[PDB]
């Protein structure tokens, strides 16, 4: 297995200036002819010319129109085409080839493949080499002239990057289109699409240059009525980049295309963004509410790459976070502005501190800029994306909006049209830092440790108040646990956004303040503090760290009720829950270990329950925030705090805590469920796809959260509410009715009803599958077998496979059945999927990421399944590398 090392970067001995492609799609094969106009670089030392080319069937290869012969002048081993240096010219030359590829049977969905009746490419990271020979790395920038030909009846719409400069008829019912894209680009941004596509379109006029941009959104004909929201999101994305960043789109046209089979969410190919249908298509009758934020996020994300990734690209793949972390940060700013709901930021933090913190304490832990890789298909991680986004966001917190915008414009202006590295971005931020500090000696050298140091820092506090001196001090310490990447961890530049709350009136005691912690510890002192405050720490979640606030539950309750910052309120609630969970977990664990016949559990704090009631009953409080406070922290968040976690004991712990709170608040929950109905389920705009109300969707989230709590509690006659909910026009409601009916004898009646409502829309059916998969059913294993035999079958669609299996893996009690049968089931699915899609097989390994954090019996059971998968003779490179790292081999 070849390991690539970040420190080994060296420019190529060759240059590719022009790519001229002819892609001829036929029924049983696709023929690709390519001429590369090439040159010798200043770094050349007379080496062999080696092209990447994976799984290509050679018809011919030539240099300057002289056909080369295998064995004598070149070798090809299905991965590398080597032309021996004695046959490589010393000045500008043309390399040409004709190869045969087979998109129909390309079920790995990389390179050129068929998704239903659409031919589509996916070239990031190293997929272009599956289409034709290339030096397949992002610093090999070239011009592209691309012709596609195909049967006209089957493939009337032909698309590639750049301007469509010719369309022509071909004998035999064929036709072609030629696309010329003069600006230099890396090959991972090449794309082609051919299909019987239908569209919606609009014209957007840029803010400053007043350029007309044509916007097109495409899908198969069946789903063309689901394209409206995506088009609105694209217009919103363009306006946001103009308004916040002053950045306009540079091209005459932007196409977005939905396909049914896609490994991830979407891809930013220049002028031709390609999407998983689940991240582009929605309608109010056929989609759950989550689709609306998802489409907004993903359309925005791909659009923002036009600058951060496309116009400014990567020198090499180790710089991935420079485009992905920065584009996620841009998407987060956009979505926060578009939704105007505090839950947008909270949802990103909730994901980071569960999924990403788990990764960062697992054997897979890596910094946002890794030092090495084997599989690029395994590099696209929540660490690179989501911790990367938080590292990119910390620059905005440190600089403030005005100087952040100044620094970002420096980055764009200096690097536009070129490759870049993480250091280029830090340099631009540093220039703004010097301006803000009015000190040309200020620097951000320490900040670079956020790119190289793995693991989550822990930040802890101690406080002191002198009533006579009116002087308050916050003593802060940071620590990162040593791991496989650094034996000694260095202190980071940690910005701590803080407020000081007066506990008597709830008011702010100081102005906006961001503490800059740059040492292992520091003491921050505040004078003229008239009363002992309660500190509001890491406002907005100002650094990606474990926060140890050292506050009492009384202090946390005061913040939960009265603080101004949504995150600190949410975090104070989280911390109250965590203290309770850890205490009850240990009480249950001791009773299990000691086989006690009787024992005591510490009750939930009654003032905390009163505080939840107070917030729930406040009509001016936010419905989305309310849904968070009645929900315990995610299992994957909890697990970072418990060694040898017994999942059954955790399930009993959560059940006790939910029952304690419900025993006091269920009548409140029911009253709110009923009173929220009118606004939550308002149908005024049901047939307007342009009208999306994020507050209303949060009201539905709150109702559906309360309904779940009341259903689990067997609240009297709640089944009546469940049945009525199943008649709602909103899929979020009627699918909720299925999941909450799991606790009643009506489950299979609702299973059949909602199946019939879902079966005729491909994406809705996938949402139905997820709802079944995560249903809290004692017979879930039998239900999964039924889904396999009746619905999923041998589908190779990643959306189908992920929908059936991933939600079930979050069933704490059932997936972690002590027999190991859930681990065995998912391992069988992984091995089956690995035969045709290694990238998706590795995604399906997700539940194993926490294996070494569980109790010793479950550790053994998971390790046995991972070792079984590793022993499969036909294991893919992707899956083998991933499991070897995960099991510490
Ligand atoms: O969709 C997303 N991410 C995209 C993305 O960054 N889009 O900008 C993304 C991820 C992995 C690949 C990728 C890599 C490979 F190595 C492959 F082989 C391959 F097939 C595909 C391609 C695109 C989520 C949702 C929005 C942002 C996070
Ligand atoms: Mg092949
Ligand atoms: Mg405008
Ligand atoms: Mg299908
Ligand atoms: Mg290891
Ligand atoms: Zn991206």
Curated annotation (Swiss-Prot):
This is Aminopeptidase N. One of its GO terms (cellular component) is membrane. May have an additional translation initiation. Translation initiation at the first Met codon would generate a form that contains the signal peptide, enters the endomembrane system, and ultimately reaches the food vacuole. Initiation of translation at an internal Met codon would result in a form that lacks the signal peptide, thereby re-directing the protein to the cytosol. A nuclear localization signal would then lead to nuclear import. The record marks 264 as: Important for substrate specificity. The record marks 600-601 as: Cleavage. It comes from the Eukaryota. It comes from Plasmodium falciparum (isolate 3D7). A peptide binds at residues 124, 265-266, 268. The keyword Magnesium does not apply. Its EC number is 3.4.11.-. The gene is M1AAP. One of its GO terms (biological process) is proteolysis. It is found in: Cytoplasm. GO terms for molecular function: aminopeptidase activity; dipeptidase activity; metalloaminopeptidase activity; zinc ion binding. Binds 1 zinc ion per subunit. Also, can use Mn(2+), Mg(2+) and Co(2+) with less efficiency. Zn(2+) binds at residues 301, 305, 324. The active site is at residue 302. The full length protein appears to be cleaved into a 120 kDa precursor. This precursor is then proteolytically cleaved at the N-terminus generating a 96 kDa form which is further processed at the C-terminus into 68 kDa and 35 kDa forms that remain associated.
